[model samples]
Target: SGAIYVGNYRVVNRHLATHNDWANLVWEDSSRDLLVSSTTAQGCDTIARCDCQTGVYYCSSRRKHYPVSFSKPSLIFVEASEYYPARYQSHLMLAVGHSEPGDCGGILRCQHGVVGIVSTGGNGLVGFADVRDLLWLDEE
Candidate 1:
């Protein structure tokens, strides 16, 4: 799992609310193009080099940066906990059995590749927002 420090309002790049309950955070630094698992911003962050807006990721293990995509499965078993009131629905993204704390803003990958992003936690489950659900990203 990788990480990013938002730090004392140090402007990174873009942070926008997309479809479902998930959003995207970009970096203003040169490394903005790079991708990580967990992003630690003012609140708390690789995985593969990715296009934040396009929802396309390139394989770093290979010499040629091949862009790849994975189809979203019906139900992904993830891990997380949630607020008392339950902020969002389940079908919005992938979910898993609660393993550790909800690594919000983190990428969710399967055997194929990245499928979603950590959104929230629920009763013994972690909710992940699908990367394919990107909407507002391409706008700004």
Candidate 2:
């Protein structure tokens, strides 16, 4: 099992103003299905899927996407517990944002989303253009 780390961080969009830019995660599955997780200033979270062959992204959240907030940190934790099965390895990833005082946020891998860990601002958000062959985990 892997251990979790904690820390504060920030996220910046080079192409656009900080306020206009939003952070999200995207990855591909073995079947080549494109997956994406998006967050909103209102603290809404939504998961979407796209077909590589057709280039269509489908939103899984109900007519109203999941709720996530920037007022606090938000993250999707991936780990292998007895509940997940031994063969699977454990991993954690997080997406956090701060907007009031100023735009500063990033992602990290941690046990608790609020715990704060690896900073994404240093690494920068994964742009849509940079994604390749990786399995994007869906929201639990």
Candidate 3:
């Protein structure tokens, strides 16, 4: 089974600056859905000395519109036990950001009306995953 890597996300819009971003996002195979907050691989996972947190917003369901500008959320994926095999095969870590500090936050991957591993759509400075990704990167 291809288990999704444990990851964290942080995204804020620089333009509107009115959107809400999530800290910890994970897949719940039990519920068969994605969510904003949770207690999974990403939960106990922590990076350096960061208390960096990343959330979700529910203004409305989801439509297909673009008053919303998305760049690419800072997505940092970390694989877990069992399914986790090989070293080079896994992405040591990944993080990308820009736009500015205060005004710029980031974006995320979403499907249906929920945030997800794979993005249906989103935009912003970039996703600076909570922390874990970096921790794992440093380990290597």
Candidate 4:
């Protein structure tokens, strides 16, 4: 038997949620407008957009000179140790496995079930709120 290695994926428009510890990233591309935002781990935020067809990202926020990292998969990992106290829990990790560039920008897919990446609005507070809102223990 062999392990599976998922390919790289990009995110366009969506919200990602992680366990209580890690931060989440949000991408919004309404109208395929090529705009995206990231909320970093420490609550810093940035906004960027891609060329209409090239998929090249350009930051339009405080750090306007920095090019956004593309082709990077958003990964999320569940904390089993953190949830050990739950009476009944389903240990499942989740991740945003991969994404494809396209006219619509890109798509982020979930992978590993135990770990994956998520999209967050370009506000640190927004990402934190999404993390708090989307995380849930599986009940099976």
Q: Pick the candidate with the highest lDDT.
A: 1
Give the higher-lDDT candidate: 3 or 4. 3
Q: After superposition, how far is residue 103 of candidate 2 from its true place, in Å?
A: 27
Which should have the higher TM-score, number 1 or number 4?
A: 1
As a whole number from 0 to 100, the lDDT of residue 134 in candidate 1 is: 32
Q: Is 1 or 4 the stronger prediction by lDDT?
A: 1
What ordering of candidates by lDDT runs from best to worst?
A: 1, 3, 2, 4
lDDT per residue (tens digit) for residues 54-118 in model 3: 22322122322222222333433322323222222121112232222221122222232222222
Judged by TM-score relative to the true structure, which candidate is superior, 3 or 4?
3
lDDT of 4 by residue, 1-140 (tens): 00111221122322121232123223332212121233232221211221111122222232222212222222322222221222221111122222111111122122212121222222221110011012221210
Better of 1 and 2 by TM-score: 1
**Tens digits of per-residue lDDT for model 2 on 9-126?**
1222222223322234322221111123333322222222222211211112212121222113222322232222223211222223221111112222112122211212212221
Q: For model 3, what is the alpha-carbon lDDT of residue 135?
A: 34
**How would you order the candidates by TM-score, starting with the best?**
1, 3, 4, 2
For each predicted model, how many residue pairs clash, with residues at least 3 apart or on different chains?
Answer: 22, 6, 15, 25
Q: Rate the local accuracy (lDDT) of all candidates.
A: 0.33, 0.21, 0.25, 0.21
Off by over 4 Å in 2: 1-25, 28-36, 42-82, 88-140
C-alpha lDDT of residue 51 in model 4: 16
Among residues 3 or more apart in sequence or in different chains, the pairs in candidate 2 whose N, CA or C atoms overlap within 3 Å are 7-116, 10-105, 11-105, 43-68, 43-69, 44-68
lDDT of 2 at 92: 22
Runs with alpha carbons beyond 4 Å of true place in candidate 1: 1-91, 99-102, 135-140
Over the full model, what C-alpha lDDT does candidate 4 score relative to the true structure? 0.21
